[PDB]
Design a protein around this ligand. Structure first.
Ligand code: G6S
Ligand code: CA
Length: 485
């Protein structure tokens, strides 16, 4: 029973840490988990977007088995059943105090959230004893903190209303009042304005509750330190959802100019500082040697994701997906293949593993560690030994997902079905919409340059058979292209 901390960054690409040898960014605090722990070269989220990757981590279920597991608005209902087995529920029944701090994006309420009372079901009802959260994303209304289902700084004399349907009569928008903007929108992100930054969706009221983006990193770090100190004498499971480098990239003043890459780079150094502050505080509390730390990212990277923040102009030679094709929103490997480090000081011996592992496996793997009785019916597989770096093999195969489109990794091979859709979305990311069943040897062709399906017809038919069996009932040959907000 060590403490367990799952740290998720938000769109942090395979090439957005220096752990794998990048010359174009420096993430020393994050790299210390990688070098001093298990550094996974073949670590995966299930999905190339937030809500589905986070759903798979929390439930141990493939998210494409839930029709609601896609990018959620801030007023979306909770997509996990109140009765369903979850990572925090398991840890709690095995003697842990549970906390979720930072990004949520799994939904809250039952479709008519009153932001002025306790919002249920939420984190509390899926097994987090403590929560202090962003409902959806830092670019989505409501721009407030939700602590155990209550909006921080709410006020009956300035009540909060949210709509993703239309503006509140009388309320300024990015379009009505462009003079109020300190950051320009590039596409979407042109509804309500908060702290000079235009957002997705419309918000009225709660002047007191409205967050300040530049102090968000510090506010969650302080909630994390409060949680650790409150529970230092107990076994705790903390889910720490960093907002960086998700748009808007408005990091604290002290991080501005730390990089050559504008707000995007500066937000990554902000996240690295949060990780450094966590490690420092664990050392201070004397907990480092009894705390298992898992660091990862919900999905692959993106430069321009809706704001004129200089990300494409100032990227220079920086390859955020570190040589992988695509990125956020892509069915190519850069969508799901993310940094993944597992660290336990004095227990795990430093290792670089090529084991095919997925965030979805943490529920069954941690379950094995703490002696859980798992229900039947989870996708989550027990690979505890691979996660501890004791064994260098885990999965033979993994399904990957990009906004409802599915593909297949099996050993050194990726099979992508063909899908009708755009080559790129407005971000410039390649979506992985190909015209034929394609096959990539990712041992030799890391960057998925070449569809070699033609010279491997036997292997292709087999990978198609296995993919159809695992996805039947969920796989859709035609998937609606969801517009960026
Ligand atoms: O990391 S995620 O939460 O999946 O990102 C969600 C994205 O949704 C898109 O509609 C917006 O254009 C992006 O700016 C971003 O907010
Ligand atoms: Ca994300």
């Amino acid at each position: 029973k060590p403490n367990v901390i799952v740290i998720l960054a938000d769109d942090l690409g395979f090439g957005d840490v220096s752990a794998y040898g990048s010359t174009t960014i420096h993430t020393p605090n994050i790299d210390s988990l990688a070098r001093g722990g298990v550094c996974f070269t073949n670590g995966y989220a299930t999905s190339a977007t937030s809500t589905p990757s986070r759903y798979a981590l929390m439930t141990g279920m493939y998210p494409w088995k839930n029709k609601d597991a896609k990018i959620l608005p801030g007023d979306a209902p909770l997509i996990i059943n109140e009765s369903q087995y979850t990572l925090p529920k398991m840890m709690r029944e095995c003697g842990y105090v549970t906390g979720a701090i930072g990004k949520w994006h799994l939904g809250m309420g039952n479709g008519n959230v009153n932001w002025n009372e306790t919002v249920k079901p939420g984190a509390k009802e899926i097994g987090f004893d403590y929560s202090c959260l962003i409902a959806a994303t830092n670019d989505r209304v409501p721009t407030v903190y939700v602590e155990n289902g209550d909006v921080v700084g709410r006020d009956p004399s300035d009540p909060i209303e949210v709509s993703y349907e239309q503006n509140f009569e009388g309320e300024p928008t990015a379009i009505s009042n462009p003079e109020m903007l300190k950051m320009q929108w590039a596409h979407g992100h042109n509804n309500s304005i908060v702290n000079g930054i235009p957002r997705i969706g419309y918000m009225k009221g709660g002047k007191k509750a409205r967050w300040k983006d530049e102090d968000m990193a510090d506010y969650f770090v302080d909630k994390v330190k409060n949680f650790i100190t409150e529970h230092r004498d107990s076994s705790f499971f903390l889910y720490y959802g960093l907002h960086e480098p998700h748009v808007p990239r408005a990091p604290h003043q002290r991080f501005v100019g730390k990089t050559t890459m504008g707000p995007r780079g500066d937000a990554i150094v902000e996240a690295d500082w949060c990780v450094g502050e966590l490690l420092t505080y664990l050392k201070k509390e004397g907990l480092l040697e009894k705390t298992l730390i898992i660091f990862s990212s919900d999905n692959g990277p993106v430069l321009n994701d809706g704001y004129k923040d200089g990300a494409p102009e100032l990227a220079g030679k920086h390859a955020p997906a570190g040589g992988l094709r695509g990125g956020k929103y892509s069915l190519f490997d850069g969508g799901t293949h993310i940094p993944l480090f597992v660290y336990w000081k004095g227990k795990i011996q430093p290792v670089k593993s090529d084991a095919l592992v997925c965030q979805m496996d943490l529920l069954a793997s941690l379950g094995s560690m703490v002696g859980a009785t798992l229900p039947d019916g989870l996708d989550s597989r027990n690979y505890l030994n691979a996660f501890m770096g004791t064994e260098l093999k885990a999965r033979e195969n993994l399904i990957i997902e990009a906004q409802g489109r599915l593909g297949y990794r099996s050993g050194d091979w990726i099979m992508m079905p063909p899908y009708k859709g755009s080559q790129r979305n407005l971000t410039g990311n390649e979506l992985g919409n190909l015209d034929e069943f394609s096959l990539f040897d990712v041992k030799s062709d890391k960057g998925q340059k070449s569809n070699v399906a033609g010279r491997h017809p036997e292997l292709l038919e087999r990978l198609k058979q296995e993919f159809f069996v695992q996805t039947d009932g969920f796989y859709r040959s035609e998937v609606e292209e969801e517009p960026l907000k």
